[PDB]
Short mmCIF file of C-alpha atoms and ligand atoms in Angstrom, two decimals:
data_model
loop_
_atom_site.label_atom_id
_atom_site.label_comp_id
_atom_site.label_asym_id
_atom_site.label_seq_id
_atom_site.Cartn_x
_atom_site.Cartn_y
_atom_site.Cartn_z
CA UNK Y 14 5.23 -4.48 27.49
CA UNK Y 15 4.75 -7.01 24.70
CA UNK Y 16 1.47 -7.86 22.94
CA UNK Y 17 -0.01 -11.24 23.83
CA UNK Y 18 0.90 -13.91 21.28
CA UNK Y 19 -2.33 -15.65 20.23
CA UNK Y 20 -2.09 -18.86 18.17
CA UNK Y 21 -4.38 -18.50 15.14
CA UNK Y 22 -6.38 -21.74 14.73
CA UNK Y 23 -3.87 -23.17 17.24
CA UNK Y 24 -1.01 -22.15 14.94
CA UNK Y 25 -2.01 -23.16 11.42
CA UNK Y 26 1.48 -22.75 9.89
CA UNK Y 27 3.28 -25.03 12.36
CA UNK Y 28 0.90 -28.01 12.77
CA UNK Y 29 -2.55 -29.06 11.46
CA UNK Y 30 -4.88 -26.24 12.44
CA UNK Y 31 -7.52 -26.76 15.11
CA UNK Y 32 -6.08 -30.08 16.40
CA UNK Y 33 -4.94 -31.12 19.87
CA UNK Y 34 -1.44 -31.71 18.45
CA UNK Y 35 -1.34 -28.08 17.34
CA UNK Y 36 -2.78 -26.79 20.64
CA UNK Y 37 -0.24 -28.72 22.71
CA UNK Y 38 2.65 -27.52 20.57
CA UNK Y 39 1.39 -23.92 20.70
CA UNK Y 40 1.32 -24.01 24.52
CA UNK Y 41 4.87 -25.41 24.46
CA UNK Y 42 5.90 -22.51 22.18
CA UNK Y 43 4.89 -20.02 24.88
CA UNK Y 44 1.71 -18.49 23.44
CA UNK Y 45 -0.47 -16.31 25.68
CA UNK Y 46 -3.80 -17.12 24.04
CA UNK Y 47 -5.43 -19.79 21.90
CA UNK Y 48 -7.72 -18.93 18.95
CA UNK Y 49 -9.91 -21.87 17.89
CA UNK Y 50 -12.64 -22.21 15.24
CA UNK Y 51 -15.79 -23.95 16.50
CA UNK Y 52 -18.62 -25.76 14.67
CA UNK Y 53 -21.21 -28.25 15.95
CA UNK Y 54 -21.83 -31.90 15.07
CA UNK Y 55 -25.23 -33.18 13.94
CA UNK Y 56 -25.70 -34.49 17.51
CA UNK Y 57 -24.90 -31.21 19.21
CA UNK Y 58 -21.25 -31.52 20.27
CA UNK Y 59 -19.02 -28.50 19.52
CA UNK Y 60 -15.89 -29.53 17.59
CA UNK Y 61 -12.93 -27.57 16.18
CA UNK Y 62 -13.11 -27.04 12.41
CA UNK Y 63 -12.75 -23.88 10.29
CA UNK Y 64 -13.73 -24.60 6.64
CA UNK Y 65 -17.32 -24.93 5.52
CA UNK Y 66 -16.67 -28.44 4.14
CA UNK Y 67 -14.83 -31.36 5.71
CA UNK Y 68 -13.04 -32.09 2.42
CA UNK Y 69 -10.83 -29.00 2.76
CA UNK Y 70 -8.74 -30.46 5.60
CA UNK Y 71 -9.91 -34.07 6.16
CA UNK Y 72 -10.47 -37.39 4.42
CA UNK Y 73 -14.25 -36.87 4.70
CA UNK Y 74 -16.73 -34.69 2.82
CA UNK Y 75 -19.73 -32.56 3.71
CA UNK Y 76 -20.61 -29.92 6.32
CA UNK Y 77 -19.65 -30.48 9.95
CA UNK Y 78 -23.31 -30.73 10.98
CA UNK Y 79 -23.85 -33.58 8.51
CA UNK Y 80 -21.92 -35.96 10.80
CA UNK Y 81 -22.17 -37.12 14.40
CA UNK Y 82 -19.30 -36.39 16.76
CA UNK Y 83 -18.32 -40.07 16.65
CA UNK Y 84 -18.01 -39.82 12.86
CA UNK Y 85 -16.11 -36.51 13.00
CA UNK Y 86 -13.56 -37.82 15.49
CA UNK Y 87 -12.67 -40.59 13.03
CA UNK Y 88 -11.63 -38.03 10.39
CA UNK Y 89 -7.97 -37.06 10.01
CA UNK Y 90 -7.78 -33.23 10.11
CA UNK Y 91 -4.12 -33.44 9.06
CA UNK Y 92 -5.04 -34.99 5.71
CA UNK Y 93 -3.98 -31.99 3.61
CA UNK Y 94 -1.37 -30.34 5.85
CA UNK Y 95 1.92 -29.60 4.12
CA UNK Y 96 5.28 -28.37 5.44
CA UNK Y 97 6.92 -25.86 3.07
CA UNK Y 98 9.70 -27.21 0.88
CA UNK Y 99 8.86 -30.71 2.12
CA UNK Y 100 6.92 -32.97 -0.23
CA UNK Y 101 3.93 -35.06 0.75
CA UNK Y 102 1.38 -34.94 3.55
CA UNK Y 103 3.20 -35.95 6.74
CA UNK Y 104 0.04 -36.38 8.83
CA UNK Y 105 -1.74 -38.81 6.49
CA UNK Y 106 0.30 -41.50 8.26
CA UNK Y 107 0.13 -39.89 11.75
CA UNK Y 108 -3.48 -38.75 12.03
CA UNK Y 109 -4.47 -35.59 13.91
CA UNK Y 110 -8.24 -36.10 14.36
CA UNK Y 111 -10.94 -33.48 14.70
CA UNK Y 112 -11.15 -32.73 18.46
CA UNK Y 113 -14.16 -31.68 20.47
CA UNK Y 114 -14.16 -28.21 21.99
CA UNK Y 115 -14.18 -29.95 25.37
CA UNK Y 116 -11.00 -31.87 24.50
CA UNK Y 117 -9.39 -28.65 23.26
CA UNK Y 118 -10.24 -26.84 26.51
CA UNK Y 119 -8.66 -29.70 28.47
CA UNK Y 120 -5.49 -29.45 26.35
CA UNK Y 121 -4.90 -25.88 27.50
CA UNK Y 122 -3.57 -24.70 30.88
CA UNK Y 123 -5.92 -23.01 33.37
CA UNK Y 124 -4.46 -19.54 32.79
CA UNK Y 125 -4.91 -19.50 29.03
CA UNK Y 126 -7.40 -17.23 27.35
CA UNK Y 127 -9.38 -18.94 24.59
CA UNK Y 128 -10.79 -17.01 21.65
CA UNK Y 129 -13.58 -19.08 20.11
CA UNK Y 130 -14.46 -18.07 16.55
CA UNK Y 131 -18.03 -19.17 15.80
CA UNK Y 132 -28.44 -22.02 16.59
CA UNK Y 133 -27.74 -24.58 17.91
CA UNK Y 134 -23.99 -23.81 17.81
CA UNK Y 135 -24.19 -20.89 20.27
CA UNK Y 136 -26.21 -22.82 22.87
CA UNK Y 137 -24.04 -25.93 22.48
CA UNK Y 138 -20.90 -23.84 23.02
CA UNK Y 139 -22.42 -22.09 26.05
CA UNK Y 140 -23.27 -25.47 27.59
CA UNK Y 141 -19.71 -26.78 27.20
CA UNK Y 142 -18.24 -23.57 28.61
CA UNK Y 143 -20.63 -23.72 31.58
CA UNK Y 144 -20.06 -27.38 32.41
CA UNK Y 145 -16.27 -27.20 32.04
CA UNK Y 146 -16.00 -23.91 33.94
CA UNK Y 147 -14.06 -22.35 31.06
CA UNK Y 148 -16.54 -19.53 30.41
CA UNK Y 149 -14.41 -17.21 32.56
CA UNK Y 150 -11.37 -17.58 30.30
CA UNK Y 151 -13.13 -17.76 26.91
CA UNK Y 152 -14.03 -14.93 24.50
CA UNK Y 153 -16.61 -15.61 21.79
CA UNK Y 154 -15.81 -13.99 18.42
CA UNK Y 155 -17.63 -13.84 15.09
CA UNK Y 156 -17.51 -11.76 11.93
CA UNK Y 157 -21.34 -12.07 11.93
CA UNK Y 158 -23.35 -9.64 14.07
CA UNK Y 159 -26.19 -12.17 14.44
CA UNK Y 160 -23.83 -14.66 16.10
CA UNK Y 161 -22.42 -11.97 18.41
CA UNK Y 162 -25.96 -10.98 19.46
CA UNK Y 163 -27.00 -14.59 20.08
CA UNK Y 164 -23.86 -15.21 22.15
CA UNK Y 165 -24.67 -12.15 24.28
CA UNK Y 166 -28.07 -13.67 25.10
CA UNK Y 167 -26.37 -16.69 26.74
CA UNK Y 168 -25.85 -16.32 30.49
CA UNK Y 169 -22.21 -16.13 31.53
CA UNK Y 170 -20.63 -15.88 28.06
CA UNK Y 171 -17.94 -13.28 27.43
CA UNK Y 172 -18.41 -11.87 23.92
CA UNK Y 173 -16.12 -9.78 21.74
CA UNK Y 174 -17.40 -6.55 20.23
CA UNK Y 175 -19.23 -7.21 16.97
CA UNK Y 176 -17.11 -6.80 13.86
CA UNK Y 177 -19.64 -4.30 12.46
CA UNK Y 178 -19.04 -1.95 15.40
CA UNK Y 179 -15.25 -2.41 15.49
CA UNK Y 180 -15.03 -1.75 11.73
CA UNK Y 181 -17.23 1.35 11.99
CA UNK Y 182 -15.09 2.83 14.76
CA UNK Y 183 -11.84 2.08 12.92
CA UNK Y 184 -13.07 3.61 9.67
CA UNK Y 185 -14.49 6.68 11.41
CA UNK Y 186 -11.10 7.22 13.03
CA UNK Y 187 -9.20 6.70 9.77
CA UNK Y 188 -11.48 8.80 7.58
CA UNK Y 189 -12.84 11.58 9.83
CA UNK Y 190 -10.85 11.33 13.12
CA UNK Y 191 -13.93 10.80 15.34
CA UNK Y 192 -14.03 8.12 18.04
CA UNK Y 193 -17.55 7.06 17.08
CA UNK Y 194 -19.32 4.99 18.22
CA UNK Y 195 -18.03 5.28 21.77
CA UNK Y 196 -15.91 2.42 23.15
CA UNK Y 197 -17.78 -0.54 24.57
CA UNK Y 198 -16.30 -0.94 28.06
CA UNK Y 199 -14.26 -4.03 28.82
CA UNK Y 200 -14.73 -5.70 25.42
CA UNK Y 201 -12.21 -7.33 23.13
CA UNK Y 202 -12.08 -6.02 19.57
CA UNK Y 203 -9.95 -7.20 16.66
CA UNK Y 204 -9.13 -6.41 13.04
CA UNK Y 205 -6.45 -7.14 10.44
CA UNK Y 206 -3.39 -4.89 10.31
CA UNK Y 207 -3.90 -4.75 6.52
CA UNK Y 208 -7.31 -5.24 4.93
CA UNK Y 209 -8.48 -5.01 1.32
CA UNK Y 210 -11.72 -3.01 1.12
CA UNK Y 211 -13.75 -1.27 -1.54
CA UNK Y 212 -14.89 2.33 -1.14
CA UNK Y 213 -18.00 3.43 -3.05
CA UNK Y 214 -19.38 6.92 -3.61
CA UNK Y 215 -22.76 7.55 -5.26
CA UNK Y 216 -23.54 10.11 -7.97
CA UNK Y 217 -26.79 11.34 -9.51
CA UNK Y 218 -26.40 8.55 -12.06
CA UNK Y 219 -23.91 5.80 -11.32
CA UNK Y 220 -21.18 5.49 -8.75
CA UNK Y 221 -17.43 5.51 -8.26
CA UNK Y 222 -15.48 2.66 -6.69
CA UNK Y 223 -11.91 2.39 -5.39
CA UNK Y 224 -10.12 -0.74 -4.20
CA UNK Y 225 -7.91 0.23 -1.25
CA UNK Y 226 -5.81 -1.58 1.33
CA UNK Y 227 -6.63 -0.19 4.78
CA UNK Y 228 -4.14 -0.06 7.67
CA UNK Y 229 -6.51 0.86 10.49
CA UNK Y 230 -4.50 0.35 13.70
CA UNK Y 231 -2.30 3.29 14.71
CA UNK Y 232 -1.58 5.12 17.96
CA UNK Y 233 -4.68 7.30 17.54
CA UNK Y 234 -7.13 4.47 16.86
CA UNK Y 235 -5.73 2.29 19.66
CA UNK Y 236 -6.15 5.20 22.07
CA UNK Y 237 -9.72 5.74 20.83
CA UNK Y 238 -10.58 2.10 21.61
CA UNK Y 239 -8.76 1.81 24.92
CA UNK Y 240 -8.70 5.16 26.73
CA UNK Y 241 -10.84 5.08 29.90
CA UNK Y 242 -12.74 2.06 28.55
CA UNK Y 243 -10.92 -1.12 29.49
CA UNK Y 244 -11.24 -2.35 25.89
CA UNK Y 245 -8.59 -4.79 24.66
CA UNK Y 246 -7.53 -4.79 21.01
CA UNK Y 247 -6.06 -7.56 18.85
CA UNK Y 248 -4.31 -7.27 15.52
CA UNK Y 249 -5.35 -10.03 13.12
CA UNK Y 250 -3.12 -11.55 10.42
CA UNK Y 251 0.18 -10.57 12.06
CA UNK Y 252 2.73 -12.32 9.81
CA UNK Y 253 5.98 -10.37 9.48
CA UNK Y 254 8.40 -8.93 11.99
CA UNK Y 255 7.31 -5.56 10.60
CA UNK Y 256 3.73 -6.38 11.58
CA UNK Y 257 4.93 -7.30 15.08
CA UNK Y 258 6.96 -4.09 15.40
CA UNK Y 259 3.92 -2.00 14.45
CA UNK Y 260 1.69 -3.83 16.96
CA UNK Y 261 4.30 -3.42 19.69
CA UNK Y 262 4.91 0.28 18.98
CA UNK Y 263 1.20 1.15 19.07
CA UNK Y 264 0.44 -1.04 22.09
CA UNK Y 265 -1.97 -3.65 20.75
CA UNK Y 266 -2.98 -5.98 23.57
CA UNK Y 267 -2.56 -9.05 21.35
CA UNK Y 268 -1.41 -10.27 17.94
CA UNK Y 269 -2.95 -13.22 16.09
CA UNK Y 270 -0.18 -15.36 14.55
CA UNK Y 271 -0.14 -18.39 12.25
CA UNK Y 272 3.28 -19.52 13.54
CA UNK Y 273 3.84 -19.57 17.30
CA UNK Y 274 7.32 -20.91 16.51
CA UNK Y 275 8.20 -17.84 14.41
CA UNK Y 276 6.62 -15.57 17.03
CA UNK Y 277 8.95 -16.99 19.71
CA UNK Y 278 11.79 -15.21 17.89
CA UNK Y 279 10.04 -11.86 18.35
CA UNK Y 280 10.43 -12.10 22.14
CA UNK Y 281 14.21 -12.70 22.27
CA UNK V 19 -2.06 33.16 0.60
CA UNK V 20 -5.79 32.58 0.17
CA UNK V 21 -7.45 29.79 -1.83
CA UNK V 22 -9.07 30.87 -5.08
CA UNK V 23 -12.81 31.46 -4.68
CA UNK V 24 -14.58 29.51 -7.44
CA UNK V 25 -18.31 30.16 -8.03
CA UNK V 26 -20.09 26.78 -8.11
CA UNK V 27 -22.52 26.76 -11.07
CA UNK V 28 -21.86 30.52 -11.16
CA UNK V 29 -22.96 30.80 -7.53
CA UNK V 30 -26.14 28.74 -7.18
CA UNK V 31 -27.15 30.15 -3.76
CA UNK V 32 -27.07 33.82 -4.81
CA UNK V 33 -28.71 33.84 -8.27
CA UNK V 34 -30.18 31.26 -10.71
CA UNK V 35 -27.37 28.79 -11.33
CA UNK V 36 -25.67 28.61 -14.72
CA UNK V 37 -27.13 31.91 -16.02
CA UNK V 38 -25.43 35.05 -17.33
CA UNK V 39 -27.07 37.02 -14.49
CA UNK V 40 -25.35 34.73 -11.99
CA UNK V 41 -22.00 34.84 -13.84
CA UNK V 42 -22.01 38.65 -13.98
CA UNK V 43 -22.88 38.93 -10.30
CA UNK V 44 -20.21 36.37 -9.36
CA UNK V 45 -17.52 38.39 -11.19
CA UNK V 46 -18.75 41.51 -9.37
CA UNK V 47 -18.43 39.61 -6.05
CA UNK V 48 -14.71 39.11 -6.69
CA UNK V 49 -14.49 35.41 -7.50
CA UNK V 50 -11.24 34.01 -8.93
CA UNK V 51 -12.78 31.22 -11.00
CA UNK V 52 -16.08 30.26 -12.61
CA UNK V 53 -17.46 26.69 -12.46
CA UNK V 54 -20.14 26.04 -15.10
CA UNK V 55 -22.11 22.91 -16.03
CA UNK V 56 -22.24 22.23 -19.78
CA UNK V 57 -24.64 20.18 -21.94
CA UNK V 58 -25.30 20.27 -25.70
CA UNK V 59 -28.43 21.16 -27.67
CA UNK V 60 -29.93 18.83 -30.27
CA UNK V 61 -28.26 21.02 -32.93
CA UNK V 62 -24.80 20.87 -31.38
CA UNK V 63 -24.47 24.12 -29.42
CA UNK V 64 -23.05 23.81 -25.88
CA UNK V 65 -25.32 25.46 -23.30
CA UNK V 66 -25.15 25.81 -19.51
CA UNK V 67 -27.47 23.44 -17.64
CA UNK V 68 -26.82 21.03 -14.75
CA UNK V 69 -29.87 18.77 -14.18
CA UNK V 70 -30.70 15.84 -16.41
CA UNK V 71 -34.17 17.27 -17.18
CA UNK V 72 -35.17 20.81 -18.12
CA UNK V 73 -38.14 20.66 -15.73
CA UNK V 74 -35.89 20.87 -12.66
CA UNK V 75 -34.98 24.53 -13.23
CA UNK V 76 -37.02 25.79 -16.23
CA UNK V 77 -40.54 26.09 -17.60
CA UNK V 78 -39.76 23.36 -20.16
CA UNK V 79 -39.45 19.58 -19.93
CA UNK V 80 -37.15 16.93 -21.36
CA UNK V 81 -33.40 16.41 -21.78
CA UNK V 82 -31.24 19.27 -23.03
CA UNK V 83 -30.46 17.40 -26.25
CA UNK V 84 -34.18 17.10 -27.03
CA UNK V 85 -34.31 20.81 -27.95
CA UNK V 86 -32.52 23.11 -30.37
CA UNK V 87 -30.48 26.00 -28.99
CA UNK V 88 -33.17 28.41 -30.19
CA UNK V 89 -35.74 26.50 -28.12
CA UNK V 90 -33.45 26.28 -25.07
CA UNK V 91 -32.72 30.01 -25.07
CA UNK V 92 -36.46 30.68 -24.78
CA UNK V 93 -36.64 28.75 -21.47
CA UNK V 94 -36.45 30.62 -18.17
CA UNK V 95 -33.73 28.94 -16.05
CA UNK V 96 -34.85 31.03 -13.06
CA UNK V 97 -38.27 29.38 -13.03
CA UNK V 98 -37.75 27.54 -9.72
CA UNK V 99 -35.15 29.73 -7.99
CA UNK V 100 -36.07 30.74 -4.46
CA UNK V 101 -34.46 33.17 -2.00
CA UNK V 102 -34.52 31.84 1.58
CA UNK V 103 -37.19 33.27 3.86
CA UNK V 104 -38.68 35.04 0.84
CA UNK V 105 -41.83 33.56 -0.68
CA UNK V 106 -42.40 33.02 -4.37
CA UNK V 107 -40.16 32.67 -7.40
CA UNK V 108 -38.68 36.12 -8.09
CA UNK V 109 -37.30 35.23 -11.53
CA UNK V 110 -40.55 33.94 -13.03
CA UNK V 111 -41.27 37.60 -13.79
CA UNK V 112 -37.64 38.55 -14.65
CA UNK V 113 -36.44 35.64 -16.76
CA UNK V 114 -32.85 34.40 -16.65
CA UNK V 115 -32.65 32.27 -19.82
CA UNK V 116 -30.43 29.29 -20.53
CA UNK V 117 -27.20 30.77 -21.99
CA UNK V 118 -24.85 29.24 -24.51
CA UNK V 119 -21.35 28.35 -23.36
CA UNK V 120 -20.14 30.97 -25.84
CA UNK V 121 -22.28 33.66 -24.17
CA UNK V 122 -21.02 32.54 -20.75
CA UNK V 123 -17.39 32.80 -21.88
CA UNK V 124 -18.07 36.32 -23.15
CA UNK V 125 -19.60 37.28 -19.78
CA UNK V 126 -16.32 36.55 -18.00
CA UNK V 127 -13.16 38.69 -17.95
CA UNK V 128 -10.06 37.56 -19.87
CA UNK V 129 -8.15 36.57 -16.73
CA UNK V 130 -10.79 34.25 -15.32
CA UNK V 131 -10.28 30.53 -15.14
CA UNK V 132 -13.33 28.53 -16.21
CA UNK V 133 -14.01 25.04 -14.87
CA UNK V 134 -16.40 23.31 -17.26
CA UNK V 135 -18.19 20.31 -15.75
CA UNK V 136 -19.29 17.98 -18.54
CA UNK V 137 -20.09 12.56 -27.88
CA UNK V 138 -20.96 14.99 -29.33
CA UNK V 139 -20.72 17.16 -26.18
CA UNK V 140 -16.91 16.91 -25.90
CA UNK V 141 -16.27 17.81 -29.55
CA UNK V 142 -18.84 20.63 -29.46
CA UNK V 143 -17.18 22.08 -26.36
CA UNK V 144 -13.71 21.77 -27.90
CA UNK V 145 -14.90 23.65 -30.99
CA UNK V 146 -16.30 26.55 -28.95
CA UNK V 147 -13.15 26.76 -26.84
CA UNK V 148 -10.98 26.73 -29.98
CA UNK V 149 -12.97 29.36 -31.88
CA UNK V 150 -13.32 31.70 -28.90
CA UNK V 151 -9.69 31.29 -27.83
CA UNK V 152 -10.79 30.36 -24.31
CA UNK V 153 -9.15 26.92 -24.29
CA UNK V 154 -6.12 28.40 -22.52
CA UNK V 155 -8.17 29.50 -19.51
CA UNK V 156 -10.63 26.58 -19.34
CA UNK V 157 -10.34 23.30 -17.38
CA UNK V 158 -12.60 20.39 -18.36
CA UNK V 159 -13.94 18.39 -15.41
CA UNK V 160 -16.11 15.28 -15.12
CA UNK V 161 -16.94 12.68 -12.50
CA UNK V 162 -16.93 10.17 -15.40
CA UNK V 163 -13.60 8.72 -16.53
CA UNK V 164 -14.92 8.18 -20.07
CA UNK V 165 -15.60 11.91 -20.45
CA UNK V 166 -12.15 12.80 -19.07
CA UNK V 167 -10.50 10.42 -21.56
CA UNK V 168 -12.51 11.78 -24.50
CA UNK V 169 -11.64 15.36 -23.51
CA UNK V 170 -7.93 14.43 -23.44
CA UNK V 171 -8.21 13.24 -27.06
CA UNK V 172 -9.23 16.76 -28.18
CA UNK V 173 -6.32 18.93 -29.31
CA UNK V 174 -5.66 21.92 -27.07
CA UNK V 175 -8.06 21.05 -24.23
CA UNK V 176 -6.86 21.32 -20.64
CA UNK V 177 -8.37 18.46 -18.64
CA UNK V 178 -8.61 17.87 -14.90
CA UNK V 179 -7.38 14.61 -13.43
CA UNK V 180 -10.07 11.93 -13.61
CA UNK V 181 -12.14 11.56 -10.46
CA UNK V 182 -11.26 7.84 -10.32
CA UNK V 183 -7.55 8.67 -9.98
CA UNK V 184 -8.03 11.57 -7.55
CA UNK V 185 -10.28 9.43 -5.33
CA UNK V 186 -7.81 6.52 -5.38
CA UNK V 187 -4.91 8.75 -4.33
CA UNK V 188 -6.95 10.40 -1.55
CA UNK V 189 -8.15 7.08 -0.15
CA UNK V 190 -4.68 5.52 -0.34
CA UNK V 191 -3.34 8.46 1.64
CA UNK V 192 -6.15 8.31 4.21
CA UNK V 193 -6.14 4.54 4.68
CA UNK V 194 -2.51 3.44 4.15
CA UNK V 195 -0.44 6.68 3.95
CA UNK V 196 0.96 5.97 0.46
CA UNK V 197 1.05 8.64 -2.26
CA UNK V 198 -0.18 6.20 -4.90
CA UNK V 199 -0.69 6.58 -7.79
CA UNK V 200 1.98 9.22 -8.32
CA UNK V 201 0.86 12.81 -8.94
CA UNK V 202 -0.07 13.71 -12.50
CA UNK V 203 2.07 16.78 -13.23
CA UNK V 204 0.34 20.10 -13.75
CA UNK V 205 -3.22 18.79 -13.42
CA UNK V 206 -6.15 20.13 -11.44
CA UNK V 207 -7.80 17.69 -9.04
CA UNK V 208 -10.83 18.21 -6.80
CA UNK V 209 -12.92 16.48 -4.17
CA UNK V 210 -15.45 17.32 -1.45
CA UNK V 211 -14.16 18.29 2.00
CA UNK V 212 -16.75 15.85 3.43
CA UNK V 213 -18.03 12.88 1.44
CA UNK V 214 -20.39 10.05 2.36
CA UNK V 215 -18.96 6.72 1.19
CA UNK V 216 -19.53 3.05 1.87
CA UNK V 217 -16.68 0.72 2.77
CA UNK V 218 -17.10 -2.98 1.99
CA UNK V 219 -14.99 -5.95 3.10
CA UNK V 220 -15.54 -9.47 1.76
CA UNK V 221 -15.67 -12.70 3.79
CA UNK V 222 -15.72 -16.37 2.80
CA UNK V 223 -19.51 -16.08 2.77
CA UNK V 224 -21.04 -12.63 2.76
CA UNK V 225 -19.57 -9.22 3.39
CA UNK V 226 -19.43 -6.37 5.86
CA UNK V 227 -20.40 -2.79 5.04
CA UNK V 228 -19.86 0.51 6.86
CA UNK V 229 -21.28 3.90 5.96
CA UNK V 230 -18.62 6.53 6.71
CA UNK V 231 -18.16 10.24 6.09
CA UNK V 232 -14.67 10.81 4.67
CA UNK V 233 -12.65 14.01 5.21
CA UNK V 234 -9.85 13.40 2.73
CA UNK V 235 -8.03 16.75 2.44
CA UNK V 236 -5.38 17.38 5.11
CA UNK V 237 -1.82 18.70 5.11
CA UNK V 238 -0.43 15.27 4.23
CA UNK V 239 -2.74 14.59 1.29
CA UNK V 240 -2.33 18.11 -0.13
CA UNK V 241 1.45 17.66 0.02
CA UNK V 242 1.14 14.27 -1.69
CA UNK V 243 -0.78 15.85 -4.59
CA UNK V 244 1.29 19.01 -4.94
CA UNK V 245 4.91 18.38 -3.95
CA UNK V 246 7.25 18.61 -6.97
CA UNK V 247 4.29 18.05 -9.31
CA UNK V 248 2.65 21.36 -10.11
CA UNK V 249 -0.76 19.83 -9.36
CA UNK V 250 -3.49 22.22 -8.20
CA UNK V 251 -6.18 21.01 -5.77
CA UNK V 252 -9.73 22.25 -5.21
CA UNK V 253 -12.02 21.56 -2.28
CA UNK V 254 -15.60 20.91 -3.40
CA UNK V 255 -18.72 21.78 -1.38
CA UNK V 256 -17.06 24.46 0.76
CA UNK V 257 -20.03 25.89 2.68
CA UNK V 258 -19.11 27.02 6.20
CA UNK V 259 -16.44 29.33 7.55
CA UNK V 260 -15.04 26.20 9.19
CA UNK V 261 -14.70 24.63 5.74
CA UNK V 262 -12.90 27.76 4.52
CA UNK V 263 -10.56 27.77 7.53
CA UNK V 264 -9.61 24.15 6.89
CA UNK V 265 -8.95 24.81 3.18
CA UNK V 266 -6.86 27.87 4.03
CA UNK V 267 -4.84 26.11 6.75
CA UNK V 268 -3.95 23.16 4.51
CA UNK V 269 -3.26 25.29 1.43
CA UNK V 270 -5.89 24.19 -1.07
CA UNK V 271 -5.43 26.11 -4.31
CA UNK V 272 -9.18 26.72 -4.62
CA UNK V 273 -12.54 26.32 -2.89
CA UNK V 274 -15.83 25.71 -4.72
CA UNK V 275 -18.58 27.86 -3.17
CA UNK V 276 -22.34 28.15 -3.70
CA UNK V 277 -22.40 31.76 -2.43
CA UNK V 278 -19.76 34.16 -3.76
CA UNK V 279 -21.46 36.81 -1.61
CA UNK V 280 -20.89 34.82 1.59
CA UNK V 281 -17.34 34.00 0.47
CA UNK V 282 -16.54 37.72 0.18
CA UNK V 283 -16.78 37.87 3.98
CA UNK V 284 -14.02 35.26 4.29
CA UNK V 285 -11.49 37.65 2.72
CA UNK V 286 -12.03 40.64 5.05
CA1 CA Q 2 -4.66 -15.60 30.69
CA1 CA Q 3 -6.91 33.40 -13.83
#
């Protein structure tokens, strides 16, 4: 079958990322999952926002937790969005505000899996997921092992495998062909199809370093993750039709795409 | 056919490394190549010695270039050699002195390839190789790209591919299946069959690190190095019969062994 199409930041190429406008359009484009970046307001309300500073995508400035939710929802998260070839910022005159996580959940249909890329953020997210009943369709992700571990201490939260463990297993497979550590049953794991890394070896005095682009998902590594484990695997940064063809051939459960509209063409 | 058996430091497990006694015994054990570690005396004579300080293997102390060749040749390079299971230091009473590179060359037969693991060292080595006529059967190696480049500026010296380039090609093959950079025609290259490395990826804030053991020589990477290039490839740190079987199966040109006596058993 086909990999799930997951809208990265609700489809950052097509519409202002992490907005309800983008979420609604991504659903309409037929995506199978919704990947959203979550931060918390100064008054403890999870909101959707990816950058470390509000100036990157809005008309405000400062960290998300420097503002109340009422202040954040007045900011236009389409402030800097551009459409290629087209000049100007089309959403400066048609604002797409920062939404709460709760609003985002409500803008998705009951079947749709949410991937939430993330103290007190973890507790605040757990409370929203509990009260809305969306914990059963939401997967908490982080690149940071401390966030993964904190999420796993919250009752009822489904948590992706930590990136440290996923990366270790992928590099063991690529470099020594061992499926180590063992799969973690039932968990989601994800990684880029192409990833710049540095490899370092140590000598008596000094070291040697190589910059290398790693392509870690292949039939063997997918089988290592998934065989007899129930693990599900997602390819990150799936951009080209060639990326999609690779993911399809090797049987990735999901692909993370910036353009749900472009991805529609991969299914007909 | 069989990989060449190359005595690492003249066969460090069997007899005091980098001594004429070890070289002579390694020849008698049927090795096909001789790997020797070269440093230079304060008065410009290349000698065989691997550690940074004389205290590691001799009854003297200090760097090699802190002593004249006359002083170095009085030191017993068997001072700390031990035979497993056997107690004591059997060469404290039967000294194996530090030899000059020139003496080492003379202790090897005219057919034997020398791998010399290395200002003014490079010039001093070039001068010995020129005057003895051994440049045609000697390959200069270093882990350090600056030493490789200096050796390549000396007329008549045969120089192994730099470790930086060999490592880059091996990791490109292992991680993305590209034979990049292209082979360097006619050159020797070498690398361990198993190598501890660290892999680092960078995030917006912070990084992720994995410690991984890399097994970089396989049929595909050997073919990348050797096909239509005339490159010759050596496996370093070949210790077990399983290591030998791998090297043989994939067609490595040579294996670097600490025990020529043990390696004899791999050929009958
Ligand atoms: Ca679903
Ligand atoms: Ca020869």
